[PDB]
Amino acid sequence: NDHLMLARQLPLKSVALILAGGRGTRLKDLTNKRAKPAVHFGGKFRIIDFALSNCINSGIRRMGVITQYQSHTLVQHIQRGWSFFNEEMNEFVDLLPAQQRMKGENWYRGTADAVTQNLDIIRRYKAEYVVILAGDHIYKQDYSRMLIDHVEKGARCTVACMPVPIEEASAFGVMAVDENDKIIEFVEKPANPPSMPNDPSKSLASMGIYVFDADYLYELLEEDDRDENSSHDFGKDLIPKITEAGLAYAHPFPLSCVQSDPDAEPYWRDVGTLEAYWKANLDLASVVPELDMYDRNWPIRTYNESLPPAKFVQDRSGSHGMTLNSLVSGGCVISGSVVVQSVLFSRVRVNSFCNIDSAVLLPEVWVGRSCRLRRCVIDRACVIPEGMVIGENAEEDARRFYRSEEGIVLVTREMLRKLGHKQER
Amino acid sequence: NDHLMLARQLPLKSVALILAGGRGTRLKDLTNKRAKPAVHFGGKFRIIDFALSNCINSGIRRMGVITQYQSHTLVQHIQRGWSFFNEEMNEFVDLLPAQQRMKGENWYRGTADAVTQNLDIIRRYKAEYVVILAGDHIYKQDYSRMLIDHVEKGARCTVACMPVPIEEASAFGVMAVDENDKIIEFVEKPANPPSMPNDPSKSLASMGIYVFDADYLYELLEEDDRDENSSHDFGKDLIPKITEAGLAYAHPFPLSCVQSDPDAEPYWRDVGTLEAYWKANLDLASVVPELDMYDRNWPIRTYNESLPPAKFVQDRSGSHGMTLNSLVSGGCVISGSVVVQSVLFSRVRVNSFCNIDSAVLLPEVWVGRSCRLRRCVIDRACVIPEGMVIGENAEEDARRFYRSEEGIVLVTREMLRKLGHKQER
Amino acid sequence: NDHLMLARQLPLKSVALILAGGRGTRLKDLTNKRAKPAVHFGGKFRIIDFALSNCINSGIRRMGVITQYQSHTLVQHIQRGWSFFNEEMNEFVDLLPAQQRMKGENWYRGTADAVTQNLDIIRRYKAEYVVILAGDHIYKQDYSRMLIDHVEKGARCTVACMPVPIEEASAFGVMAVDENDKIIEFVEKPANPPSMPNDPSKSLASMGIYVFDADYLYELLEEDDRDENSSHDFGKDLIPKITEAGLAYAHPFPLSCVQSDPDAEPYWRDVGTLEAYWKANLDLASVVPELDMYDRNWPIRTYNESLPPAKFVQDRSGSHGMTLNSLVSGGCVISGSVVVQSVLFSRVRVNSFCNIDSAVLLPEVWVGRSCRLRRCVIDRACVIPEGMVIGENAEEDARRFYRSEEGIVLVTREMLRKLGHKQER
Amino acid sequence: NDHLMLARQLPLKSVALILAGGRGTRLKDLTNKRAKPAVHFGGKFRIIDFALSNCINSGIRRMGVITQYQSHTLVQHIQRGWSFFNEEMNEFVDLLPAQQRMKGENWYRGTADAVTQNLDIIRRYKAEYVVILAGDHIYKQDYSRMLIDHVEKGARCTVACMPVPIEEASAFGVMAVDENDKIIEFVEKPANPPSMPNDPSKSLASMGIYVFDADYLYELLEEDDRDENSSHDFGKDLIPKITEAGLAYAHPFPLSCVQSDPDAEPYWRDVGTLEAYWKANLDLASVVPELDMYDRNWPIRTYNESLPPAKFVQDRSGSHGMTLNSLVSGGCVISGSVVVQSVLFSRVRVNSFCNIDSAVLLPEVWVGRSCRLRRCVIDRACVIPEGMVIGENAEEDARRFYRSEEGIVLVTREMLRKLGHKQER
Ligand SMILES: Nc1ncnc2c1ncn2[C@@H]1O[C@H](COP(=O)(O)O)[C@@H](O)[C@H]1O
Numbered sequence A, B, C, D: 001n002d003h004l005m006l007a008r009q010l011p012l013k014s015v016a017l018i019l020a021g022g023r024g025t026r027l028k029d030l031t032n033k034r035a036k037p038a039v040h041f042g043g044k045f046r047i048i049d050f051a052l053s054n055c056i057n058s059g060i061r062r063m064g065v066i067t068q069y070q071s072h073t074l075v076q077h078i079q080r081g082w083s084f085f086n087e088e089m090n091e092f093v094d095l096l097p098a099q100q101r102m103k104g105e106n107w108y109r110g111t112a113d114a115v116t117q118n119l120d121i122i123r124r125y126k127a128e129y130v131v132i133l134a135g136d137h138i139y140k141q142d143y144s145r146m147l148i149d150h151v152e153k154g155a156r157c158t159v160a161c162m163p164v165p166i167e168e169a170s171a172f173g174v175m176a177v178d179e180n181d182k183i184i185e186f187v188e189k190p191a192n193p194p195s196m197p198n199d200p201s202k203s204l205a206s207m208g209i210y211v212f213d214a215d216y217l218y219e220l221l222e223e224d225d226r227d228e229n230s231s232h233d234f235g236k237d238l239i240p241k242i243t244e245a246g247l248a249y250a251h252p253f254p255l256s257c258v259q260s261d262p263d264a265e266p267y268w269r270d271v272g273t274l275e276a277y278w279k280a281n282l283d284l285a286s287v288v289p290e291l292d293m294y295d296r297n298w299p300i301r302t303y304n305e306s307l308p309p310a311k312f313v314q315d316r317s318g319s320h321g322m323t324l325n326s327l328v329s330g331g332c333v334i335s336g337s338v339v340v341q342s343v344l345f346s347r348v349r350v351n352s353f354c355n356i357d358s359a360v361l362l363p364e365v366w367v368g369r370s371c372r373l374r375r376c377v378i379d380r381a382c383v384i385p386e387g388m389v390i391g392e393n394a395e396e397d398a399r400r401f402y403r404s405e406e407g408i409v410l411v412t413r414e415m416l417r418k419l420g421h422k423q424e425r
């Protein structure tokens, strides 16, 4: 029951709801002053530019960004890079922070209790298909090929599923499907992740990407908001409820994935822990990145900040600066040091005689003279002092900064401010 | 201690901070779903477009909007009509809602406790002169003539004062000055407002417009934030502390007021109660408004929403529609009815045989056939039913809707929904 | 060749080219200082906002505006209302005026000689389907349903045809089709318009809307640009050449027309003479307009100018102002006069005791006291003096102003400045 | 007449007119497809971003850009980087190309015959002080210190003069002043530039920056447009006319220059010939640039294009890429080559084994494998083939490309297309 012009009308009758929401507690000290969607990525992006540029390029120009925890950077970023819309053309990016009225009320008890507080505003949009996007994730998806796959099957809810290794399948929503892609068994974040049939080493996992018949969502949240034992969550409460009525279908992600190399596998990185954040950025620095960002058929929109060109200058001794598989964004000033496998964001000043290897330097970092950096993540505005050594003595990096179990170091201003180093340059 | 070009450099060394903040509890039900700065005004404005367009036309392009209570409409309005800035030219409108973490903290204890939570962000602006604007007020001021008076007097704090009648001086900050415009005695919201010398019928009142030496403000809040018995307010705690050191000067508003008729008195309306809101809008509908809005030397910037022309059509009987001293904004459709002394905002539909007199019809109102309206304020999206009569029986309007002591009626959806009228259009 | 998602990919592979181009000599004095696409219409629109908002809502966000004659107002209008695009998202409105060098060259010899001068720029867009839009016309078309019909018939060129009366078929490119919508006989602006089969009173006319295979267009212009006897026009030279090879199909306009009343006929006004301009605007003033402009599923984008509400005030004698089936846009100030069947654009000042009937008052017009206006078009910024009478003596309106054969008067500043009246208010 | 607030009101009463105008014939082939104001500079700027960002930061937000020769790139640049204005706040960038009506009229005969053709539009702005800016020049000037010095002296015209070497003074307007900065003798482009008193090696030259009383300008052009012996130029016709009446004063540029190092001399480069274009860009690459572009108190606004970070990758052999005193803007991809004293603009692709020394690589250049480049300017989109050698054999670089007398090479697509190299990558 699909018309030949159906692929262009369904995005125009649809509304996306990005659950920027809370944080990732697994990113110890990267998030303490920001939400996980506002974590920097890619030299110039934040994570929420991925869950927003896929709505645009999918025709969905009606988004709803639900923000609760440390949203000042997020909201300022939406204001400055996602406020080119005109509300007359049926397009907007509405911010829906919890409405504060009394002393301390209305704080969004859950993921599914944030779309129910704002259920008097979303009704006004008059949307038939509600995409429910987790916007703390990194991907390149076309939701006008998932909306169709939702409309062909005659479904009421449509969960985007993609297989992942059973080792990491205890952190996502594992399901089980049939020949018609109907969800039979759904369980959220199990302790013993069930495997797929014919693939014992992999589990069919939910990505946090639900498409909903709007008439069904509203009747499902109002029918769940009165539940006293509910935890108010899509995975932990609702999707089991839809599944047990047999109204929940599964949409494979490889179908609706935008990738420039069809021979490759789909790219999904959720930046769960610190190690996967670091590994995810340097993938862009390699020679053949898994994530294409020089792609013009699916571009990513962000805050086009005005920065001068990246300047490389001679050190105090007149010598050269060497580079190898690195990204140097605008504003940077690298005074003749060695930079390898690194990602430097905007306005990173790197003075002389430094050595930087497999590092990620978030913006406005100042590296002092004669510093050695190996396998680290330097947070925003960190003023590294002269002669600092990082990533060569694991026993001396665990008791100064934070050091993951896999060997990744994280540097913040508070970590440096606690050792006496002044961070007011 | 002045200079030739000083009048142009100080707005650029300056930063404004709009305390959009809380509400006006004296605006009974007009605010229950919005902040007082987001109350509509003038057919197309909100109140915070006055405290923001005086920063632009005074050269202050660095503003800081502090929003706590019901800011969804406010933040959406700033997003859509005040997001044309480019952060590279040293200009921005930063939104500073209270940072929420752990799900119940940081709720801004006071007016002066909202500039102390955000005192790590405002330092980054590197501003010498901090203008502190109450943005729930209506005026036309030039803060590049108040900054000079502050920079021409050697002041540390400079309170904009204007005289008001002693009857209404119990709701503002009454002060007392000397021959050099030095504040001698300041008391906040007295029960017996002291009169001026030589003018027993009027009191010298603070408008809520403080200009501050930045070096003094940061040292004054951090010296006040540690106080456990303080109420955390500019008027109630800080301005007496500055006054008692003799570092607080007074800047008369008639000097820095922008008015097209120099023979007139300065215009200040803080839309305190309901009655002054109604009286303030209809002042624009009279023949000679006290507030000039057809002024091109000091224009007011707002959300230029795309609306069709105001349409006047014949009623069901083919008859004419009469108008008398009224404002009809864009989108409106008036089907042959009588409109007098009224202000119709955007998208107001007025069906046949209506009679509307001294009314204010906030946006998206639908008036049904054969309605009579007198001395009323119809709130957003109210769907008035057919044959409703308002403003002719005071005993029958007080038990349906809200009716002030002076005779002004207010109509909301909740008031109409409670009488059985369906508000689903 | 009709794939599930073909309806959404073809607009992105497409590029529109608006031939704003020359003028309408049949608009005697309305155009003398502007291009016909920049003629005002609708109270707030210009004609080129129709050929541009149909590209946006059809997904075609890459437009090319070819401007030659008096484009100052046009270019300024595109600059201020059509410059919200970001070139990184594959979207833009490129202005392509003739490139002037040596002070006397490159002046666009024809309609199809304007897309050949800019053919070193349009190749860079890398477009497969080139829509060729005449943008001096008024309609509501969906070019993502003409593009489908173009890709599902296997066509190389596809001319949008609609039947019109044989009495107005001498100014269009009349064709003749077959059962498969293949153009058999095309002749451009005949003296005896051939009729349709079974409809002797109507002719199947070209609207000026060609969709082209881009690989065919470039090879057709370069194969025509070398022709010495060609007139360099799409109708007079190219479309006959395509037709005579049998590669030209016809797309009926009723299929790809957006109208809110399916029972109605498609709306197409070329605003040819003066009489159809006047008649076209007042259709919006009637009770049931043929053109829906309160439509939210196909809105029209324009210069959203910041204007105050429409003010109606009492005249010198304290009397009422009456209105009947009229449009009053923003900025207007009507001092107690009678306005009937009229359309007032922005900033129209109408002083006391006026009588205005079936008029169109283009922007910034000042009507003086005691003026009577009937069946007229008042041009931009015309300062009508006190006691002027228009539309009651045809013999006295033909020797002052311009008066069409049908009774429509046109008033310009030059017509009024020639009678001695000062036009410098 | 030095009023307290005069420094802030005069920019708002003022209007700037950038004579983007014609070309520099002295830039042999750099300009053949663009105007000299649209020549690229600085890695991301064009020259007219200098004559435009000084109006913004000087408070002048009403600009008028007069464009005649090859303005497609210029106009597109203003459209995309200088169209953030709102005409309601009294601010705009009006483009004023010559009006074409019949078939080859209205071709700006001179510099001063372009402000006379557009004299019906500039009267509408209602400006008292008309700044006349040559926008083919590079500087950092504050015109709110030049407008004041014009108003203190009680002048009618105020020519910004700065001393330059007598060797290059035959290309500017040499004048002679008195103790009160009154112009005594003005002569335009002499063959023997007269020297200054006490500085025989230097001449007091006009920069092309005239401030005018508007009531005098309109009366001077209309009194000059009717002259049959006039050449219609500010220098060659008008400024002698003002000087011979004694109404022309001189404003030294060092007063109103914005420079971060007060010990330095003012920076003025007219980018005359090819050699001063190359030398002007590489000045930004040195360690201490003469032009500060990391200045936040006087930033330069431009088309903030969305480009990915600058990527450095390993060559085919796995080796390092070295850099020394170079600028690499965004989009670039340098595959392990040596870059010295260079300036790479956006989207410059540099394949392996290249050697680049004192080069300027304008955008979208592709350098092939094993290329050596020395003292060259590679124009837009040049696709350099594999193994090309430039700047090592002057006799072999003069008969291929263009080579100045000083040794600077210029490479264009037409120069490469004529040697057989395909330039369609
Ligand atoms: N230059 C800076 N110095 C110190 N903190 C900053 C700076 N810029 C931003 N921040 C803060 O760093 C935190 C993270 O911001 P961001 O890295 O932009 O998400 C927020 O608390 C910001 O206010």
Ligand SMILES: Nc1ncnc2c1ncn2[C@@H]1O[C@H](COP(=O)(O)O)[C@@H](O)[C@H]1O
Binding pocket: A121, A124, B033, B034, B038, B073, B364, B380, B381
């Ligand atoms: N058309 C409408 N119908 C019902 N409520 C509305 C409508 N438009 C806005 N609102 C709500 O009215 C309240 C006040 O919004 P505002 O009048 O824009 O300050 C908010 O809760 C809005 O979400």
Ligand SMILES: Nc1ncnc2c1ncn2[C@@H]1O[C@H](COP(=O)(O)O)[C@@H](O)[C@H]1O
Binding pocket: C033, C034, C038, C073, C364, C380, C381, D121
């Ligand atoms: N207020 C005005 N008074 C006189 N001429 C105007 C005014 N506004 C625009 N024009 C001119 O009227 C012509 C048509 O402009 P437009 O009506 O905008 O297409 C152009 O030559 C404009 O410069």
Ligand SMILES: Nc1ncnc2c1ncn2[C@@H]1O[C@H](COP(=O)(O)O)[C@@H](O)[C@H]1O
Binding pocket: C121, C124, D033, D034, D038, D073, D364, D380, D381
């Ligand atoms: N990628 C490209 N390939 C060939 N020509 C181009 C390219 N980009 C711009 N041009 C042309 O180069 C000339 C100069 O443009 P610009 O360098 O932008 O001033 C104009 O004719 C442009 O249309």
